[PDB]
Amino acid sequence: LSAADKTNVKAAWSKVGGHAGEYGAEALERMFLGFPTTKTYFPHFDLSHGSAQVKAHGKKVGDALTLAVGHLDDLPGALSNLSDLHAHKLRVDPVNFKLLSHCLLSTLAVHLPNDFTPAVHASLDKFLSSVSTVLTSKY
């Protein structure tokens, strides 16, 4: 990411603030409904609306994104644990990272319409592609 992107991403995430977990849960829900093939990775979850498992997992996702925003200059190091999980253990098809990214952007648009400007959308898209690349890097 460029330095201007980094600045936009840190700025945009400070506006997300403490809602990162709630946005991560909503993004997951949007993904499970819009893209039902993704549900096969979560056989052990109650995928009900308001499910506590989705809410808890959304919190883990939002926390990892917040961690990534604090480590933009070394995402592979900060996320290496998660790379092994998604590529070797879970074998997540890389296409699904595009779907979750889209659902996360959709969620940010819903809740931060005045902050979700074209330049910020473009920097967040690059950030989410860069996270996704790291998480699929072990294959």
Partner: protein, 146 residues
């Protein structure tokens, strides 16, 4: 498109509230800013260097309105998508040579722009139905590439 009867009614009811000019201009502009290789197709339109020049370019707004109007035609003809877009598919394949992956990109940008305009009214379930619509349109536009 595999859409229930309750789903279609929710899709149509949202379209009643869509300003084709505002939504369309914003969706085409965001495509050009976020996926900058798409600018290659629109050199006719002039200055597209920075986001500010894109979003205020009058030709971007006018073309986005035309794109959204044709989307609205698809929305009102969901049982005949291939035939509604046949002529446009020929135009995009044979004359402009747009890779069809870009139809999917624009459809997803449109969904993000609907989300931004309608907020909490753009529910996970309503997004899911719009994802089926935009995919149906992207595949109808890709029909004559095959």
């Amino acid at each position: 498109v595999q859409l229930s009867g309750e789903e279609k009614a929710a899709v149509l009811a949202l379209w009643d509230k869509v300003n084709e000019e505002e939504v369309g201009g914003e969706a085409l502009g965001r495509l050009l800013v976020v996926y900058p290789w798409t600018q290659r197709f629109f050199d006719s339109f002039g200055d597209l260097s920075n986001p500010g020049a894109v979003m205020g370019n009058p030709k971007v707004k006018a073309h986005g309105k035309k794109v959204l109007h044709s989307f609205g035609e698809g929305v009102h003809h969901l049982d005949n998508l291939k035939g509604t877009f046949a002529a446009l598919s020929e135009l995009h394949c044979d004359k402009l040579h747009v890779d069809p992956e870009n139809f999917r990109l624009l459809g997803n940008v449109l969904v993000v722009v609907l989300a931004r305009h309608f907020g909490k009214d753009f529910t996970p379930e309503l997004q899911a139905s719009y994802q089926k619509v935009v995919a149906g349109v992207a595949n109808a536009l890709a029909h004559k590439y095959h």
